[PDB]
Amino acid sequence: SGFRKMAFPSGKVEGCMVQVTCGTTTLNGLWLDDVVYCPRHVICTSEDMLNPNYEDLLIRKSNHNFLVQAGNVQLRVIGHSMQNCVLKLKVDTANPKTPKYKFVRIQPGQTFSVLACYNGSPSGVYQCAMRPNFTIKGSFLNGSCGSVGFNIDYDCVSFCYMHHMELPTGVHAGTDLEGNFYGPFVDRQTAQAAGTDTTITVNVLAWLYAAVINGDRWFLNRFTTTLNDFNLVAMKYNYEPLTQDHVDILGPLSAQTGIAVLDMCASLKELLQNGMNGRTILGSALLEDEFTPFDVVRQCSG
Amino acid sequence: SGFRKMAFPSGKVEGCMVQVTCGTTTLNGLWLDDVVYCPRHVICTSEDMLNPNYEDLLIRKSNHNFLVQAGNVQLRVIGHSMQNCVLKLKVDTANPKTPKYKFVRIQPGQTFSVLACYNGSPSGVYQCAMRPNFTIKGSFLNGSCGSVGFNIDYDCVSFCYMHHMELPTGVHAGTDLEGNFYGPFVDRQTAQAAGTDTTITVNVLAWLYAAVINGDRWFLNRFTTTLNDFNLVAMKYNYEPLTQDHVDILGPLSAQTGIAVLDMCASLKELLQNGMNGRTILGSALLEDEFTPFDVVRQCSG
Ligand SMILES: *[C@](O)(C(N)=O)[C@H](CC1CCC1)NC(=O)[C@@H]1[C@@H]2[C@H](CN1C(=O)[C@@H](NC(=O)NC(C)(C)C)C(C)(C)C)C2(C)C
Ligand SMILES: *[C@](O)(C(N)=O)[C@H](CC1CCC1)NC(=O)[C@@H]1[C@@H]2[C@H](CN1C(=O)[C@@H](NC(=O)NC(C)(C)C)C(C)(C)C)C2(C)C
Ligand SMILES: [Cl-]
Numbered sequence: 001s002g003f004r005k006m007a008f009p010s011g012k013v014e015g016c017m018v019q020v021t022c023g024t025t026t027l028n029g030l031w032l033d034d035v036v037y038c039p040r041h042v043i044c045t046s047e048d049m050l051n052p053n054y055e056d057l058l059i060r061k062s063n064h065n066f067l068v069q070a071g072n073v074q075l076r077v078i079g080h081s082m083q084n085c086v087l088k089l090k091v092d093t094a095n096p097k098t099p100k101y102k103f104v105r106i107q108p109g110q111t112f113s114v115l116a117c118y119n120g121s122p123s124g125v126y127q128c129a130m131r132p133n134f135t136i137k138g139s140f141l142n143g144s145c146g147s148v149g150f151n152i153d154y155d156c157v158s159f160c161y162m163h164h165m166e167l168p169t170g171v172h173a174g175t176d177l178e179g180n181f182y183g184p185f186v187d188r189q190t191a192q193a194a195g196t197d198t199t200i201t202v203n204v205l206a207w208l209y210a211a212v213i214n215g216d217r218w219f220l221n222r223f224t225t226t227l228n229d230f231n232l233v234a235m236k237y238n239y240e241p242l243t244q245d246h247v248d249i250l251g252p253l254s255a256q257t258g259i260a261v262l263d264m265c266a267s268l269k270e271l272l273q274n275g276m277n278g279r280t281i282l283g284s285a286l287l288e289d290e291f292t293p294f295d296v297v298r299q300c301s302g
Numbered sequence: 303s304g305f306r307k308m309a310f311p312s313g314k315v316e317g318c319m320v321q322v323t324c325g326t327t328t329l330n331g332l333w334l335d336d337v338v339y340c341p342r343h344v345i346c347t348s349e350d351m352l353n354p355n356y357e358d359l360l361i362r363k364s365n366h367n368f369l370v371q372a373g374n375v376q377l378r379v380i381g382h383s384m385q386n387c388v389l390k391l392k393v394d395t396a397n398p399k400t401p402k403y404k405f406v407r408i409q410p411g412q413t414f415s416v417l418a419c420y421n422g423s424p425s426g427v428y429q430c431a432m433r434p435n436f437t438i439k440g441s442f443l444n445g446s447c448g449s450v451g452f453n454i455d456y457d458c459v460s461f462c463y464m465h466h467m468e469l470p471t472g473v474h475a476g477t478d479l480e481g482n483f484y485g486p487f488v489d490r491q492t493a494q495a496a497g498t499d500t501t502i503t504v505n506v507l508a509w510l511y512a513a514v515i516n517g518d519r520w521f522l523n524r525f526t527t528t529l530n531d532f533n534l535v536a537m538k539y540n541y542e543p544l545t546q547d548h549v550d551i552l553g554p555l556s557a558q559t560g561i562a563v564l565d566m567c568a569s570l571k572e573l574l575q576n577g578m579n580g581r582t583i584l585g586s587a588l589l590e591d592e593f594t595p596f597d598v599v600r601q602c603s604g
Contacts, residue, residue: 001472002441006426011313118604124308139304170303285587302420
């Protein structure tokens with residue numbers, strides 16, 4: 001038994017991380033095939049950061065202003081390009097450690113493993129959720145930019161996030177690997193709002209299912225509810241409205257616990273309404289929304 | 303900014319995990335040099351498990367009863383040995399992916415990265431603390447046995463845990479890599495007590511320091527305390543008694559926050575005494591004791 005925030009093994013992604021220096025700025029790059037991907041603001045000075053014209057700024061840059069290092073090895077850039085908010089640096093060598101990979105754009109409520117790097121060196125790995133407001137709550141210091149988020153499905157790495165910037169609270173924004181920001185963010189040092197974040201209701205139910213499977217049952221109750229009734233007690237508490245896919249996606253967990261999704265929704269209502277009263281579920285004194293149904297199935301089966 | 307439970311990158315350890323089958327039992331092995339290490343209870347039947355004589359049970363086993371697989375490759379065992387509660391299977395091939403490594407026995411209150419495996423395949427990575435009672439709170443299903451816990455210092459893997467068994471609550475016990483159990487546990491399916499677990503006070507202070515560094519200050523208070531006075535309010539609340547090394551180890555964090563350790567101890571007392579009143583510190587509604595001072599320094603500096 002036991003239930004933990006667990007990241008995918010990071011090995012396949014370690015061999016893809018390089019260092020990228022342009023002028024004074026150094027940060028992380030993803031080297032797949034003959035292409036290093038990194039955030040385009042590696043070309044900015046402290047000053048440019050306030051209101052950059054990236055086209056103009058990049059014109060002043062030539063292949064030899066881009067210092068790509070892979071441990072001790074340096075890579076000949078033979079082509080620079082911009083795709084939205086990322087730099088593609090075409091290099092001479094194909095990364096021999098290149099894994100089967102894809103670039104996917106993940107949807108709000110989905111999770112992925114971040115391999116946080118500094119100077120092209122991986123320092124650690126943890127799981128994030130894409131929040132409904134398209135922020136993440138990570139651990140990213142100066143130098144962390146260009147670190148990536150990924151899923152491993154089969155033997156195939158699905159790259160879905162690259163880190164760009166930090167927002168007031170301590171929350172992170174970044175791009176997919178084609179360089180489109182998740183959410184309304186631009187790579188400019190100028191006031192931008194994240195706006196209201198809500199709880200991923202289906203993930204909270206997935207987690208209650210994980211609780212029951214590990215024996216934590218105390219919150220399980222005699223009552224039930226309707227979808228409408230509950231979903232009016234959701235929005236009250238800023239929770240993503242529960243749909244019928246959400247029900248059908250909890251099937252495997254409903255199936256394994258022999259607990260109907262709507263019985264479980266009624267246990268949630270009383271915790272939203274009566275709090276947790278100083279009790280814990282799975283070592284946590286609050287409701288956890290950063291595990292998907294699949295995250296729970298993967299961990300609670302094998 | 304940001305502060306997360308972060309595991310070391312798992313790559314160096316992925317290339318060391320093999321499958322080990324004896325009779326019906328299959329579990330995980332650590333292949334370093336010409337030696338595969340695994341739990342010795344791979345030789346037991348469901349029945350043997352209740353009261354094994356390992357010496358006697360192992361005599362009936364010969365090199366060819368041990369089926370070691372590394373993905374699709376099979377390894378010729380040319381020597382079986384028992385060191386306390388682990389099997390050393392001498393094989394023909396030296397693991398070419400063998401990293402600089404050491405075997406260390408970690409002390410209660412220290413943390414390490416678990417790479418959880420099934421059938422010799424890594425499925426995920428997370429951080430654990432060796433609890434004061436020498437249990438961990440992991441995520442280990444049938445097949446997880448032989449999964450290892452490690453630190454990466456410099457380029458050198460320090461192997462410190464191998465998973466053997468689960469204790470009532472959902473808590474895990476295992477050995478160092480010489481095969482000595484942490485704590486009073488024996489590899490026999492017979493009633494054993496963990497007995498009373500206490501909170502790693504120095505780790506809770508390290509975490510309050512991480513909070514302050516990320517801006518969460520509300521619990522910071524005007525008061526101070528003595529070491530004796532606080533340490534009498536510790537044991538009340540089952541907390542490891544705070545020593546002067548603990549003070550001197552918090553130096554780097556005291557140094558960076560400009561907050562004396564004993565001011566911080568007085569903030570802790572009021573949270574132990576007045577609870578958290580529905581507020582959160584670093585996204586948690588309870589006091590976190592599974593980050594060491596070094597874990598916090600590593601993450602909060604680079
Ligand atoms: C990286 O680029 C890096 N080199 O690691 C860096 C990581 C952060 C954490 C300290 C620096 N990110 C940025 O520098 C990022 C780049 C400029 C400014 N950036 C910010 O993240 C800024 N945030 C910010 O301005 N936020 C709001 C936009 C005003 C909402 C910081 C204030 C955190 C520096 C750009 C192009 C946004
Ligand atoms: C592994 O050996 C494995 N193959 O993965 C396994 C993992 C656990 C999780 C389900 C099985 N561990 C054991 O089988 C372990 C081996 C026997 C019995 N084991 C237990 O962990 C048992 N615990 C237990 O008996 N606990 C107390 C000791 C009575 C305190 C289980 C009941 C969990 C099976 C041995 C040699 C202890
Ligand atoms: Cl919590």
